[PDB]
Design a protein around this ligand. Structure first.
Ligand SMILES: CSC/C=C(/NCc1c(COP(=O)(O)O)cnc(C)c1O)C(=O)O
Ligand SMILES: CSC/C=C(/NCc1c(COP(=O)(O)O)cnc(C)c1O)C(=O)O
Ligand SMILES: CSC/C=C(/NCc1c(COP(=O)(O)O)cnc(C)c1O)C(=O)O
Ligand SMILES: CSC/C=C(/NCc1c(COP(=O)(O)O)cnc(C)c1O)C(=O)O
Lengths: 392, 392, 398, 392
């Protein structure tokens, strides 16, 4: 079995099948012709090799799909036009009125919005459980419960989940486990190998790695992905990934190992630096020993990742002055780009909110999330240095 | 107000805002930064002009949107990953359980699938009506009727609706009218100007014009597009258009008028040919005096379009052999490409079942659909001629 | 009636020629080979790709399947054996002249050339011992008279940039058959849809595919079309060794997209320009006006003889001089102030206050242009909007 | 002065100058307009700093150029359509009939072809010299010597030049020193800092990193680069880089350091392995302690590179059998891709030659060149190992 980086470069593709082309050609085409109508009948019945329309399937998307399937260790992959594309396509096919979905305690803003203000308003019951608390989960299981969905680590506290523990419970009750594995990437965490059924990504983040596409991946069993493709994607979202973006995504995946190694190495130093500072109150970085859930994080994630969350003494005001002081970090939402991004949900994403509304959710007054990039660490240190001095 | 071709080339863009670039640069970026946090606060409150993340909005996509809005005579536009992306995003935000939606009698298959096996399995009521029969439409209306959705001309029999008559009934009862205007494009038909609220396109077809992108456009009021953008696209489908494909779509649109002129002139000659041949039993083309809704066709479409549908005397068998015989025409689903295409749904998209399923779901045994391309008309004629002989 | 040996029409071939979807997974649009290098099954299937026998691929700077399709298709349209695709028009010109010419060879040139072509010849290749001579190519007696034994290449544009001077291409090729020269014709302005120098006796044509062939102003590209032997030579020396002007398969894919509507776009360019040129000639403000479709145009009968339609380029002079032209341009709200052609967008330039602004009034004649001159590339906008813009712009030059 | 990684990600670009876009927009446009004739007057002069045509100066290309300049420690940059683009544009500008160019003893095939069968046949003198031998260089200099051109390390044996010694000899005679820095990249070796005047790159190799573009770079003094822009590129080659490919190149440059680190570590290992084999007659890798020019190599190269050349004892025949048995390395010319590549010049690029014409030229019978890729070293070892066993 060839290694991770080998597979990220080579898996699913022989140059000799495409006129010797070293980089696979991009199938920037909407439709594919048939030799016969009989051949074309068989492609809608779904019982052959080949193609018909790019919304369903496309060779450039198929290579990306298979290759991602290999990295995560799953049977099938599906490519979609965004992370939300992946999540919504997946959830729209597995859930019908009167089914229940168990969710992690904290979710990504638009995943939360989709669940509560979207599918949740179509008669699907919602319920939030601590996915580190196996006791609380096992209680909350009912026969109506069809899907268990969560992020590990979770946005933005880095709250972990006992994936193996959750999956053993779900296996007994018949529930399908779906993990948003965006923050880690298969390089760092493979939830399918810990019993999960499906993993979804925002490929927009670390997989692409260069902040120039919006994209989504689903990986899991052949049976589950076939359904999500032929219902969620085909009928219910239309979240079709451009072959051009699919090709750029594959370009990024070829440096995933190298990019994450450095993300994690830079993140480590900045976390350890931030720990030893009078301005900081607490830090949520999985590779600091003071991290609440250090043990579980290391059983699942091979490295601590590139994301640091931390709160400041001075709260809302200390954040604004810190964020505005940054001359190298960019004030922006998103993560996993080569460029180092900072965001402060208190006065950016959730700014029209007041302090009285924020505490409802698991989202602090002083909380500033970093996505540590690939820049020279000494420059990143110096930028954070002056930004903390400016936040007094 | 400048002419169609002028607007389809220039609307919404001045080179002097982008370093004098004649062609607008492609914003192939997932995320955008802010100079301060208080600036970025307003971009999430929706109260200050600018960008944050390409799933919600992007400048390349905004240009496409605004330009498409001008061509349809609408206030605002939204760009999506596919036509189904356009449809699902739209209907997911506009309907909730208990709402009734009146559909036209025939619909494009994935739209039929989405309605009956997708959204209509989450407690949304569906009824089918002949939108040509204004008495029956009026009679079909209820207060719970929230949406009237149809294609005009309809897949795959070219059936027509009086858009203004339908809109009048919709103003009476208080219902939103959504027209799928793929077949015609804004160049030949503008449903908003005949009282429609929203129009949806598969921009994959005529608007693209070159078979290379998958895309969708919604055009309507600012109020409705904003809801579709902020809920259907953002939370519920994630069907985000690549700035690459958005830019190609705009390239395609620059020759829309010229391309449609040729599609229509070619299709007219081919329709009049097909009507004279002994192998052909019925022909549906709007530019033929024999078309049942001929008056309405000239009253509502400025030209009769590029699509022909017809039936061969020898049934399914003759269709197969007609289809197999084509050397210039390509066997493929889809329409609106430079390349002339044909399909015989009876032995392609809707194959396995006997005549009895194909009757009630109104697609004849011998029905062949043609998307007439931009090739030399003599070449197309010659290909169709020999294919008819071979059909017997 | 008639059978398979009939040539498919121009629009059919501009969309289909050289590509059957069945040889590429059924993909209706050809896959873009956005790859720099190609691999070999055995080590000997690499050996034969460099030398002699094999049909196949190794490196994109010599040959790429996306570029090959473009090439074969441009060849069909021009009526040539072979095509080559390059990074720019100047890529096509330099790559061609670098392989056909050596020190001591003479090149006979059209009286006017495109600026960077003129520069290439006088200040580039001409300084490496290639001898230069200009002749009015409309004068077949003068051309005959200028032929020497060292004359290796007759090169020229028709119509020329920017005065739209023309040459008898068949007349030139006949003179060249007798003496032995290779005729190269820059066919940018007409495109294969309006004029086909190869079918009138020219040995090679070159294009700035950046213009009408692309049609949408988003790529820079060149094409050479001509005999297999001459194109192969150009590919294997001019492009391989001497320019490295390699076309991106991305841009080659877009050029093929533009070529799918060439006939339609040229039809509309020409229709607009004819209506605009006839309008322009009847206006008070205009001194003269060159446009091949007007009978006043000096070479009206040659234009009709060689071009199937009169093109999208207009030239005219204003009353009021530079001061009027200066105001005319600034008054344009729909036309752009730019130098290029063959875009969907209509472009104007007033060389007095633009491209030759640093020059002085009298220096214009003996470098070679007028004082109220305005070149127009007529685009694809609704003709009424283009009239209204030129009308109000004339009124502001008054 | 920020670190190499920081500059390779940020240099020359602020998001705020383009609507906050994190990644810069791609200026896929041929022409640029002017607001007035007075503005457009000075773009054919120089005193107004805008744009006019993309063959001369495009915003996307300029960013690439400025950034490549920064990494190389030079004043200014030029982007071109291929490595040969950069080489030919540079040499056509600097050389004329009667001028002599001094060359490194062995050059890349098409550079040798350009010099001897292109520009050499226009009255330009050629002389090859050993560029490590400063005594032989000074002796070779004449008044006609205007340019000194070489690779370091060079094809095929990794033969170094003494760049600082060469520049010292050139400074005496006024001549210009041009260094092909393709193999090393600015990450490993910066010839301008050691006294050279111009560097050229086939950005097609390591700079891109991913084998999907063809691009050239020139970096040097503003006056020199300006001339190669306005003479070599504008008039004499027209080797204009696509903004699309220039965008990809810059995408590739953001992982240059990380990719070069891994290339070099995989090479280090695989050379240590190869140097101890019974099948290996001789091996050229800069990092081996027994490399002839080891000391000088480490004065210029911060790491020994990703390329290995070695000789098999069985001659041309063993090379053939080794090449063919490789299942993971691809058989191709080119280098610096993520995918590992191998060529055996004696049965590929130079097979039409006879046994005695290879030595004359400067190539061995059993010489195999390896571009060591980014794959898992254990897979690469396995593949080379079995290929060595099958070579006997
Ligand atoms: C309000 S814009 C900010 C978006 C952010 N993230 C996106 C994201 C998605 C959704 O993925 P797309 O659909 O491709 O965006 C899914 N899952 C995770 C863990 C994510 O982080 C952000 O600020 O971290
Ligand atoms: C079973 S594959 C055949 C697809 C066909 N058409 C697509 C289409 C869509 C959906 O649009 P996308 O999502 O962009 O494909 C929406 N609305 C209309 C009137 C359409 O024709 C077809 O065969 O005509
Ligand atoms: C100073 S920018 C103006 C450029 C113009 N034309 C280009 C051109 C070329 C050169 O082709 P590229 O290298 O692709 O640009 C070659 N041959 C012809 C007849 C051309 O028109 C122009 O203003 O008409
Ligand atoms: C006969 S195809 C093989 C090409 C090879 N290399 C190219 C190259 C160039 C020229 O660069 P482009 O023009 O981009 O190809 C310049 N400088 C160096 C050190 C190079 O290696 C090769 O096999 O190593």
């Amino acid at each position: 079995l060839p290694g991770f980086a080998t597979r990220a470069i080579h898996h699913g593709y022989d140059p000799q099948d495409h006129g010797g082309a070293l980089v696979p050609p991009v199938y920037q085409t909407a439709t594919f012709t048939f030799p016969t109508v009989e051949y074309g009948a068989a492609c809608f019945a779904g019982e052959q090799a080949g193609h018909f329309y790019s919304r369903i399937s496309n060779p450039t998307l198929n290579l990306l799909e298979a290759r991602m399937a290999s990295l995560e260790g799953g049977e099938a992959g599906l490519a979609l036009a965004s992370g939300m594309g992946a999540i919504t396509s997946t959830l729209w096919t597995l859930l019908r009125p009167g089914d229940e979905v168990l969710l992690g305690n904290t979710l990504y803003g638009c995943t939360f919005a989709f669940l509560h203000h979207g599918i949740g308003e179509f008669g699907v019951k919602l319920r939030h459980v601590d996915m580190a608390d196996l006791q609380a989960l096992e209680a909350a299981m009912t026969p109506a419960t069809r899907v268990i969905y969560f992020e590990s680590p979770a946005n933005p506290n880095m709250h972990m989940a006992d994936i193996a523990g959750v999956a053993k419970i779900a296996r007994k009750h018949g529930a399908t486990v779906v993990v948003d594995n965006t923050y880690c990437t298969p390089y760092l965490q493979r939830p399918l190998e810990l019993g999960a059924d499906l993993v979804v990504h925002s490929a927009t983040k670390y997989l692409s790695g260069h902040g120039d596409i919006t994209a989504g991946i689903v990986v899991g069993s052949q049976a589950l992905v076939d359904r999500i493709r032929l219902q969620g994607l085909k009928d219910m979202t239309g979240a079709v990934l451009s072959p051009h973006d699919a090709a750029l995504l594959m370009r990024g995946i070829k440096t995933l190992n190298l990019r994450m190694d450095r993300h994690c190495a830079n993140a480590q130093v900045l976390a350890e630096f931030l720990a030893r500072q009078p301005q900081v109150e607490l830090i949520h970085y999985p590779g600091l020993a003071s991290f609440p859930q250090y043990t579980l994080a290391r059983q699942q994630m091979s490295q601590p990742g590139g994301m640091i969350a931390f709160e400041l003494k001075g709260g809302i005001g200390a954040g604004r002055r810190f964020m505005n002081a940054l001359q190298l970090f960019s004030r922006a939402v998103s993560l996993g780009d080569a460029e180092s991004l900072a965001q402060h949900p208190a006065s950016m994403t959730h700014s029209s909110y007041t302090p009285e509304e924020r505490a409802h959710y698991g989202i602090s007054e002083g909380l500033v999330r970093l996505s540590v990039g690939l820049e020279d660490i000494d420059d990143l240190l110096a930028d954070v240095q002056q930004a903390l001095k400016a936040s007094a």
